Amino acid sequence: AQFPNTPSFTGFNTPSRIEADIADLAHEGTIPQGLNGAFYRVQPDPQFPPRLDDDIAFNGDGMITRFHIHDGQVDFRQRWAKTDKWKLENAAGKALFGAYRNPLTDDEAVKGEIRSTANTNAFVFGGKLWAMKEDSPALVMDPATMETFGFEKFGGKMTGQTFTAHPKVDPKTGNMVAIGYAASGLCTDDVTYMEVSPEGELVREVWFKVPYYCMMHDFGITEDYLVLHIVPSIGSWERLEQGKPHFGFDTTMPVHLGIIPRRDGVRQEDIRWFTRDNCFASHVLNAWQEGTKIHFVTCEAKNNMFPFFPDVHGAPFNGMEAMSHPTDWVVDMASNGEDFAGIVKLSDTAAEFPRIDDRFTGQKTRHGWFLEMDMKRPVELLMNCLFHKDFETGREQHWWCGPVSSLQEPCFVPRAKDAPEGDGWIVQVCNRLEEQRSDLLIFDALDIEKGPVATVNIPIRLRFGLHGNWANADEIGLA
């Protein structure tokens, strides 16, 4: 097929569309014998050229990559996430769905169909692989064969239209905690709060309303609460009618933080809202309670981080104000009123794609890992560093991938089920941009600054990834 000659489909964004298997990737260094499991990640990768002359990267069909690490070797498997969209378009031999989150640009033949590309997260839970996209139910797949089952509607018990791509697992119960925004239709202010049991049952779906419709991409959990930030990357049917990107950022609107009790029968009146001045924040490192306080650690920027979801009043993109920093938003449940208790910048390092040792989700975490944008580094062609913060000692570690590479989201892998927090490894894809290929890097998680202990060569150029996760072999049918 002939694709557009635009930045979204050329250079690093050239379509790939490869399904493949490779055993025992070539490598340097020593692949830890203690790793036995798999790292899953997803890349948007268009099956067909877009209906409109220039689509964006966030809109490509989900292609799932798995790195099966065992016995000191890494095997590679890549397969399509076979969404209804993928299947419909494969049958038709052409694109049928249009622009990002814009049903007014779809073929009449797919009116009412689920629009998911399942392209944002590859998450393992309850014996299934979840290929996730926040405008639809999640797609479920077999984590071992990577065949596709279909969308998870919980047998029809799910009443909302959508499911998050940033699920959190509660370490105490083992439940997946999820939201679904735009729950009653596009651009609505209805949201669901859901929990899924380890056995796969939807055990709670609570409907509530938020102050305004916006991109509710991420959230936090604590022991007793779901913590939902309301940030004004807004959208509307009118925007779609006027031919604009679904979302745009409004610098004049306030930011809110909602505290939803994680219990049966929660009502709107049970939800507490805090309010602060405008900023941008997308990803959540973690959240926790301490005394009467809730600590919500996010990557906050002064202004919009999505150039493709532009300022709603026509401002050009401000790259300097898009720089995000790990920041603790602190609210006090024993206070009166809506003011935050604190907004505390935690590092001067510019960072995003935050990760923790997920075994400690919802509890106070000593460690965080991030992709860092170090604008001081040489560049000979930008997420160019891996960044680790020890929040107890304050010590920061950095590893730079060099002047002709960039990095994808890291993932923490525990050494053992009983290992202390952060005792284990970091895995991440590295884009060798000049060489037109990719590496899988493996680090000792608490000494990233010495460099990866193994560099695993991938003889296939991977595309831009979104989110990824590790699961142990006995969780994915590979033991």
| Binding-site residues from annotation for Fe(3+) | 166, 217, 283, 467
- CA separation for the pair 95, 90 (Å, rounded): 8
- CA separation for the pair 124, 476 (Å, rounded): 8
Q: Is the dihedral of CA 233, 236, 239, 244 positive or negative?
A: positive
Dig out the tokens for 455 from the structure.
Answer: 């560099």
Tell me the sheet residues that pair with 286: 297
- CA separation for the pair 422, 106 (Å, rounded): 46
Q: Give the CA-trace dihedral at 199, 202, 204, 210, to 10 degrees.
A: 130
Tell me the sheet residues that pair with 368: 389
Q: Which residue in 367, 370, 471 sits closest to 421, CA to CA?
A: 367
Planar angle of CA 235, 150, 206, nearest 5 degrees: 50
Strands (E), 239-292: 247-249, 255-261, 272-276, 280-290
Dig out the tokens for 81 from the structure.
Answer: 């996430």
**Binding site residues for Fe cation, as ranges?**
166, 217, 283, 467
**Binding site residues, as ranges?**
166, 217, 283, 467
If you count them, how many residues does the chain have?
479
- CA separation for the pair 152, 130 (Å, rounded): 9
- Check the chain for breaks (C–N over 2.5 Å) and list the residue before each, or none: 381
